[PDB]
A paper describes a structure:
The RGA5-HMA2 domain is contrived based on the high structural similarity of AvrPib with two MAX effectors, AVR-Pia and AVR1-CO39, recognized by cognate RGA5-HMA, the binding interface between AVR1-CO39 and RGA5-HMA, and the distinct surface charge of AvrPib and RAG5-HMA. Therefore, we reasoned that the mutation causing two amino acid substitutions (S1027V and G1009D) in the interface of the RGA5-HMA domain might interact with AvrPib while decreasing the binding ability to AVR1-CO39. V1027 of HMA2 could form the hydrophobic interaction with V27 of AvrPib, while it could affect the interaction with Y40 of AVR1-CO39. The G-to-D mutation at 1,009 of HMA2 could repel D35 of AVR1-CO39 while forming the salt bridge with R23 of AvrPib. Since there is a positively charged patch on the surface of AvrPib, the C-terminal K-rich region of the HMA domain would have blocked the interaction between RGA5-HMA and AvrPib. To circumvent the issue, we generated the RGA5-HMAK/E variant (K to E mutations including K at the 1,071, 1,073, 1,080, 1,081, 1,085, and 1,086 sites). However, no interaction was detected between RGA5-HMAK/E and AvrPib. Finally, we contrived another RGA variant, RGA5-HMAS1027V, G1009D, K/E (henceforth RGA5-HMA2), by combining all the above mutations, which were confirmed to resemble the native RGA5-HMA structure. Again, we performed a Y2H assay, which showed that RGA5-HMA2 could interact with AvrPib but not with AVR-Pia, implying that the mutations in RGA5-HMA2, which do not affect the conformation of the domain, acquire the binding affinity to the originally unrecognized MAX effector AvrPib. The data obtained from the MST assays also confirmed the interaction between RGA5-HMA2 and AvrPib, which displayed a dissociation constant (Kd) of 148 μM, compared to 31 μM for the RGA5-HMA/AVR-Pia interaction.
Numbering used by the authors:
A (entry chain J), B (entry chain A), C (entry chain G), D (entry chain M), E (entry chain K), F (entry chain D), ...: 997 to 1069
């Protein structure tokens, strides 16, 4: 199990649901949550997640997406 | 902000992803989580979520779902 | 069976007993307890107990009651 | 706080509810519970309860009452 | 110097606040307090109050209302 | 003779057993099987099977179930 | 997995259902079937089946049971 | 004399002849018959018949034998 | 179904059992019996029995067999 | 569940009551009955009855008894 | 000969044998039986039985007992 | 809904009136009626009657009383 | 001279005669009598009576018998 933290631009709600649903759609993901002072940290925890192709999908479908953390549990 | 626990028929991983992404796509949802020894408990946390509509939508796309818990956070 | 948590403003023993005896008179109720570091959580467990009706009746008789949780056991 | 168990004649639901509401009505009571295999064991937990007047109050309003356990926790 | 007690149908805190504010709006009332074991009684004190208009407005805007007492102080 | 396929939330082996035995205990049933990649398809073959009754029994003593197919052999 | 064939005295539908439900109730069983020109051979397939325990259960509740074959698949 | 009934699985007639000829081979036996709507009841009457020994003989050579009755005539 | 009576020379235990086990051995027989004042009458009832064949093989294995009665029941 | 018929010396009705109450007091016994033209046949039906211990007990308190029949139901 | 049906609280085996041995001990009783879906119908058949003193004795030592039927044969 | 017939010793009209009045007083009695060739039977009809206390009362206050019939309508 | 009393299971007149004639057939016996409220006591009085042999004779040809008394006259 891995923990991924992505800084994403998600000003409103329809866009924060957009990022959340896209990360949730990756097989193996068992936790998705938005955290941080500025509602800017998408954290994805699961198994068999490729952090690279996940952040690529975020950038293609949302906006800027920087990968801040990839850690084991 | 309320927390909702739904028992959902999601026996594999493409089906867990589809329930996670469905819950995630609801505006105001902040946390979607897979839990339970049998991995059939969808935990959903967020603002102004309608648990009845949520469970009906899970029922539509996953075929079988049952509300277990609604809690004010 | 079902577990229901109501937050009730019951600062002294008489208001505590009023809320607890009231919930205990509801047919189908097999557990009542006051919990929480603030001693403000009324826990009611039983069969066929309607959450809305119980809060309504806490509001009619004692006042200062808020539904916190409803959970299948 | 202490724990008290009284075997009470409680055949139906009007009878459980008045036994339970009676115990819940005494000051200091934290927990009231209907236990046992035949639903005759009224568990009462709380502070400063005199088991003697409580069973006396139960005999006086719910028929035969049998003090079976009092113990500190 | 007249004191008025009205039994009102107000079985929740929202309802109790509404009946109290309406009572305090009528000409001549100095003080509105709520009383009664189940918080179903307004006490209204003042000079030059018409209790007929007071109770009739509570009936129109807040449901059922019964004038229990009109007495000097 | 008739074949029926029911999707059933039977995530573990104990609940698969109870779905199997429920179907098996219907008089006339010649075949009960757990099929499907996700081991969630109960197939029943026999004489005088009532599909609606059987799903209802499955719901009642198994939780969630959905009729997928009724076929005459 | 393992296939088991047991000869069982089950001359009517109620005793066919009895033996069939009995085998179905064994954890790990995914196939139960009545075969044979004489309708007296029940086929049990699944995982972790203890043949002695199964046949002894059939005999203890149906009177007559005789293990014919144990076959790996 | 003594009458013994054994339930025997004898679906065809080589198995019926085999059980019935073997019970007849027992010295002391002056009646054997196959009775029952299921034709599964081997009845044997005679003098000095040991029921335990006869059923053991049936189990050794035929299999699928169960003692149903022993009565003095 | 048909009834046959044969006078057989069967003086001792072994000879009765041999006679009766051979009649019991014929397919279709469902009762065999030794009646008669002096032990000598072998009663055989069943379906599709040929009396001449039966007596023939009795004479071959027990010496002297006389056919006394053939009757439909 | 077995049925047991015992011949018991119970010539009057104080002694029939003695035998019937002793059979009745055996755990698992659900039918006791006086039968026979001479009213000396005690019929006992139930679960886990030991016929020999039962006859021995009848013999101890009624003086004479003899086992006549043991039958599976 | 009269038939008597008493509803008796006899949840375990020791308790059903206590009631039965008490009814069997009544002179003139020739049948005692437990029936009903819930095994709570004590059936007593015999001669010169007073149902009143019988149900009184039942209540005196086996909880409560309700006389459901007195009828002739 | 039950009908009770009591043979009562009441050999004159004063006695007949007394026993009927007594029967009409006990709980659950709706109708009392005198019958029999010699006007010696009570017919008592009602719901929730204890026949034991009824016949015991007649025994205590009006002499001999035999419960001939307890039966539903 | 000696007197012997035997309890015999002789529930009809046919078997009382068999017991009587048996005791009478013993050389040296000059009194045989059926005594007792329940007519089950055989009294034998005479010379050279073997009590054990007589009871053995009674059992062998009368069924059940129990020696009650042996007295020298």
């Amino acid at each position: 199990r891995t923990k991924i933290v992505v800084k994403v631009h998600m000003p409103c709600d329809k866009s924060r649901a957009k990022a959340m649903a896209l990360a949730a759609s990756v097989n193996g993901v068992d936790v998705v949550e938005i955290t941080g002072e500025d509602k800017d940290r998408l954290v994805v925890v699961g198994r068999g997640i490729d952090p690279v192709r996940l952040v690529a999908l975020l950038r293609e479908k949302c906006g800027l997406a920087e990968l801040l953390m990839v850690e084991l549990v």
